[PDB]
Amino acid sequence: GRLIYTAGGYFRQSLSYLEAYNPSNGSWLRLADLQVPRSGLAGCVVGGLLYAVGGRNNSPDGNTDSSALDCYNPMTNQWSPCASMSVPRNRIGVGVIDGHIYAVGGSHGCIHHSSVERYEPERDEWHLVAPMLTRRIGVGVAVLNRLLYAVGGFDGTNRLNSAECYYPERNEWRMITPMNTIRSGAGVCVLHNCIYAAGGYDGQDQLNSVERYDVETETWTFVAPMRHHRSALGITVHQGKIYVLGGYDGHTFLDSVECYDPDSDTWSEVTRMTSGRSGVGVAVTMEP
Numbered sequence: 347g348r349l350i351y352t353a354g355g356y357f358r359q360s361l362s363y364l365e366a367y368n369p370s371n372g373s374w375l376r377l378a379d380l381q382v383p384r385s386g387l388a389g390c391v392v393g394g395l396l397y398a399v400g401g402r403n404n405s406p407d408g409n410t411d412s413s414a415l416d417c418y419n420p421m422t423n424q425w426s427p428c429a430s431m432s433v434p435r436n437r438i439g440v441g442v443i444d445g446h447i448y449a450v451g452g453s454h455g456c457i458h459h460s461s462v463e464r465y466e467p468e469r470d471e472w473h474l475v476a477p478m479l480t481r482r483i484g485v486g487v488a489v490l491n492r493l494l495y496a497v498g499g500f501d502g503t504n505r506l507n508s509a510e511c512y513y514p515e516r517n518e519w520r521m522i523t524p525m526n527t528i529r530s531g532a533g534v535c536v537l538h539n540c541i542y543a544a545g546g547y548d549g550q551d552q553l554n555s556v557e558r559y560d561v562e563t564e565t566w567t568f569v570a571p572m573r574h575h576r577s578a579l580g581i582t583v584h585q586g587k588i589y590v591l592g593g594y595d596g597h598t599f600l601d602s603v604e605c606y607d608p609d610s611d612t613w614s615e616v617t618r619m620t621s622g623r624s625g626v627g628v629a630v631t632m633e634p
């Protein structure tokens with residue numbers, strides 16, 4: 347569609363913001379708040395509807411991991427609850443295949459999930475599928491050619507450079523080539539025939555480097571780095587360019603939004619969020 351939606355996130359506490367950015371004119375709209383604050387969620391779109399999945403509500407009076415699935419309709423500017431997942435999943439990743447939402451990994455307290463489940467909007471039902479070979483929280487998830495990829499994360503002991511791919515007709519996960527960088531809390535997306543991994547935390551520093559996996563060659567190659575180091579960033583694709591939103595650079599919760607042009611291999615700053623934040627969910631759909 348036409349707008350980049352950012353939902354939730356964190357600054358001092360988990361946030362309820364829903365704000366939509368219009369690349370064609372630089373404007374930001376503040377829309378209906380989430381019913382429950384959440385950071386560490388993921389966003390996706392199915393059938394023009396925006397979905398917010400998992401996360402946690404970190405507040406002064408609690409830390410509650412979320413199993414929730416909530417649906418925002420831009421025509422109504424209203425959120426509606428959907429069926430909840432089998433388990434809470436903070437620091438989640440999600441991907442959409444053939445109209446179904448895959449929820450991957452994430453945490454529930456000290457439980458680091460390898461489990462994966464699939465939502466069918468037409469039935470308002472979740473079902474578990476085969477689990478990953480690795481437990482992954484802060485996991486980047488992307489879909490390319492109707493295969494599901496889980497990239498990096500944290501397994502409960504180590505941050506990971508490993509990645510793996512889910513083959514739905516076989517209900518099976520297989521490792522792919524590992525990245526050249528350990529990345530947890532990175533932004534992962536697909537552009538053309540490559541899976542991009544931008545930023546994240548490597549155990550020592552937040553990262554500005556960006557690398558992409560070419561599914562034809564099975565190799566990871568670095569591209570131009572972002573202007574800002576960032577972990578727990580939001581990421582999406584809009585008209586053939588990658589947009590990264592917010593995150594944490596080790597000093598500040600960023601309001602910076604950067605845009606990658608793959609033809610020129612350059613990043614530029616395109617706008618600022620209305621306030622700095624990390625751990626947002628991001629997706630693109632029609633204006634409301």
Ligand SMILES: O=C(O)CN(c1cccc(-n2ncc(C(=O)O)c2C2CC2)c1)S(=O)(=O)c1ccccc1
Pocket residue numbers: 355356385386402436437483484485499500505530531546547577578594624625626
């Ligand atoms: O949930 C939480 O603990 C916090 N948030 C969050 C959200 C998504 C992913 C990750 N994440 N997962 C594994 C690692 C890992 O350090 O290896 C991480 C972090 C990002 C590198 C965490 S946050 O509120 O947005 C937030 C982010 C940064 C600073 C303060 C708060």
